[PDB]
């Protein structure tokens, strides 16, 4: 076969579908890392811009997976996607030693493990956290943020009485996401799990929510509505909550981490006045909780170069690449060691406060629900929202919610 520029060059070409280089800096950075890996290893690489919209990205990836296409080796997948994409993922478990796997938060490794397959490595993350006004806590004699829900409610009532007396009729104690949508599922998982009430649906498939601790969790949350939280909280998603908070009108907020940098912006009324920590829990013997978000890296089951693709994924999820992502882009690492890295904390000191968040991360039940996740989530947010609006109590809601999820997850073919 003759040589010439138009003839085939031998050798692998490793193709990554990552964040888009057209939108913001995340995709430009990710492509820079892929190209760096290619240069350091002598491996040709190509980069595919993925949609920023999660549903559009999933659709794009499904065009490849439907065909068992070899044309992407590495995909960047959402936290709830392992549960639906596992058959399209190479099992990474044989390629990682225990020492290597243990460097990641175990709850995020668990999220990515579906019927024993390690579908993907943790890349960067997000979870539900507590925002608190440190100025106001100091003013009212508190030296640390609340560790329990009762403390939260006590502090909220004291600070609300003092700020309303001083004349701010718009001031509240707590804002969160109470609207009947996906975000309520995430708030509710935190409430229930942090009361010792379980994970709604357990990783082994047990529908555990009909229990006394879960019921209290929900009744407690109803007890906030119109009292330490606005009556309108039952219509709030993430940005309605952030609006009240960022105006200076809430002592506490539950939200995702994106609100932190927005609150520190030049014109923000609350710039320099807040901290973050893990959400409270019912008592010291209960566990903490933070509903898990974020992104993972999968090697395609259809890759023609699985070993090389794995090498690239391990590199992208490595200590130094995650560190670069944290220092340059403020992405939250999936390695606990980075939360005490002196260079990460010099750039992002508040990251330290998130270590207990990710040590206590819990996932929505996408592992077990598969193609029926949205049905299960809708059941959860509907029943929980029924409690927040006073239309039913927690005991009935958790009973009704168990029944709803059982119907959704039941095998079609019954046998009497």
Q: What's the number of domains the chain is made of?
A: 2
Asked if residue 306 and residue 263 are part of one domain, the reply reads: no
Which CATH number do you get for residue 276? 3.40.190.10
Query: Whole-angstrom Cα distance, residue 1 to residue 19?
Result: 39
CA 93 to chain centre: 22
Whole-number Å distance between alpha carbons of 171 and 243 = 12
Q: Are 137 and 263 in contact (CB under 8 A)?
A: no
Same domain, 172 and 159: yes
- Identify each DSSP E strand in 126-273 by its residue range: 129-133, 172-175, 250-255
The three-state secondary structure class of 31 is: helix
d(CA 280, CA 264): 23
Are both 223 and 287 inside the same structural domain?
yes
Taking the C-alpha atoms of residue 376 and residue 380, their distance in angstroms, rounded to an integer, is 6
Q: Are 136 and 164 in contact (CB under 8 A)?
A: no
d(C-alpha 411, C-alpha 416), whole Å: 13
The domain boundary, picked from 336, 360, 384, lies at 360
| Placement of tokens 């995430």 in the chain | 186
Q: Are residues 339 and 383 in the same domain?
A: no
- Token pair in block for residue 169: 């009729």
Residues 314 and 272 reside in one and the same domain? no
Cα 388 from Cα 382, distance rounded (Å)? 10
The alpha helices in 147-211, defined as continuous H runs, are 149-165, 182-194
Domain boundary among the residues 315, 338, 360 is at: 360
| Resolution of this structure in Å | 1.6
Alpha-carbon distance of 198 to 181, in angstroms, equals 21
| Token pair for 245 | 């908070």
Beta-carbon contacts of residue 394 (< 8 Å; ≥ 6 apart): 214, 215, 216, 217, 218, 219, 222, 387
Burial 25-46 (b: 16+ CB within 10 A, else e): ebbebbbebbeebbeeeebebb
**Beta sheet of 274-277, edge-to-edge order:** 172-175, 250-255, 129-133, 274-277
Measured distance CA(302)–CA(66) in Å, rounded: 11
Q: Are residues 84 and 15 in the same domain?
A: yes
Whole domain around residue 6: which residue ranges? 1-126+293-360
Instruction: State whether 329 and 185 are in the same domain.
Output: no
Q: Of 333, 360, 387, which residue sits at a domain end?
A: 360
Tokens of 360: 């206590």
Q: Based on the domain organization, do 153 and 250 belong to the same domain? A: yes
Instruction: Give yes or no: residues 32 and 18 share one domain.
Output: yes
Alpha carbon dihedral 234, 235, 238, 242, in 10-degree steps, equals -90
Chain Cα centroid distance, residue 139: 32
The string of DSSP codes covering 321-369 is HHHHHHHHH-PEES-GGGGG-HHHHHH-GGGGGGHHHHHTEE--THHHH
Do 165 and 254 have their domain in common?
yes
Element (H, E) at 32: helix 26-41
Examine the domain organization and report whether 237 and 108 are in the same domain: no
Which residue pairs from 19-25 have beta carbons closer than 8 angstroms and sit at least 24 positions apart in sequence? 19/49, 19/50, 19/52, 19/76, 20/49, 20/50, 20/51, 20/52, 21/47, 21/49, 22/49, 23/52, 25/329
Instruction: Please give the Cα distance from 192 to 290 (Å, whole number).
Output: 11
Tell whether 96 and 221 lie within a shared domain. no
């Amino acid at each position: 076969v003759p040589r010439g520029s138009h003839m085939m060059q031998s050798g692998p070409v490793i193709r990554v579908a990552g964040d888009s280089t057209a939108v913001g800096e995340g995709g430009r950075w990710m492509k820079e890392m892929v190209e760096a890996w290619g240069k350091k290893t002598g491996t040709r690489v190509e980069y595919i811009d993925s949609p920023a919209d999660t549903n559009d990205r999933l659709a794009l990836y499904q065009q490849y997976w439907a065909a068992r296409s070899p044309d992407v080796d590495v995909y960047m997948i959402d936290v709830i996607w392992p549960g639906i994409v596992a058959p399209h993922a190479l099992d990474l478990k044989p390629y990682l030693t225990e020492a290597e796997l243990k460097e990641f938060f175990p709850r995020i490794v668990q999220n990515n493990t579906i019927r024993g397959k390690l579908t993907s490595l943790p890349f960067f993350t997000d979870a539900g956290i507590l925002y608190y006004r440190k100025d106001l806590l100091e003013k009212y004699g508190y030296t640390s943020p609340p560790r329990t829900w009762n403390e939260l409610e006590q502090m909220a009532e004291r600070v609300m009485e003092g700020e309303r007396r001083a004349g701010n009729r718009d001031f509240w104690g707590f804002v969160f996401q109470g609207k009947p949508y996906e975000g309520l599922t995430c708030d509710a998982l935190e409430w229930i799990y942090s009361h010792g009430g379980g994970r709604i649906v357990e990783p082994d498939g047990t529908i555990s929510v009909n229990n006394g601790r879960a019921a209290l969790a929900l009744n407690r949350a109803h007890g906030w509505v119109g009292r330490i939280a606005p009556q309108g909280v039952t219509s709030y998603a993430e940005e309605e909550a952030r609006n009240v908070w960022q105006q200076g009108n809430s002592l506490f907020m539950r939200n995702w981490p994106y609100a932190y940098a927005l609150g520190q912006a030049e014109g923000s009324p609350i710039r320099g006045k807040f901290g973050v920590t893990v959400l409270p829990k019912a008592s010291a013997d209960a566990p903490n909780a933070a509903t898990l978000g974020g992104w993972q890296l999968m090697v395609s089951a259809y890759s023609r170069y699985p070993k090389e693709a794995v090498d690239l994924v391990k590199y992208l999820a490595s200590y130094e690449v995650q560190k670069d992502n944290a220092v340059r882009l403020s992405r939250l690492p999936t390695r606990p060691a980075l939360y005490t890295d002196r260079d990460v904390l010099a750039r992002n000191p508040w990251f330290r406060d998130l270590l207990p968040v990710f040590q206590n991360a819990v996932s929505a039940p996408s592992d077990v629900a598969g193609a029926r996740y949205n049905q299960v989530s809708e059941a959860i947010w509907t029943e929980v929202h029924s409690v927040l609006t006073g239309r039913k109590k927690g005991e009935q809601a958790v009973r009704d919610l168990e029944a709803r999820i059982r119907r959704i997850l039941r095998h079609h073919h019954h046998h009497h």
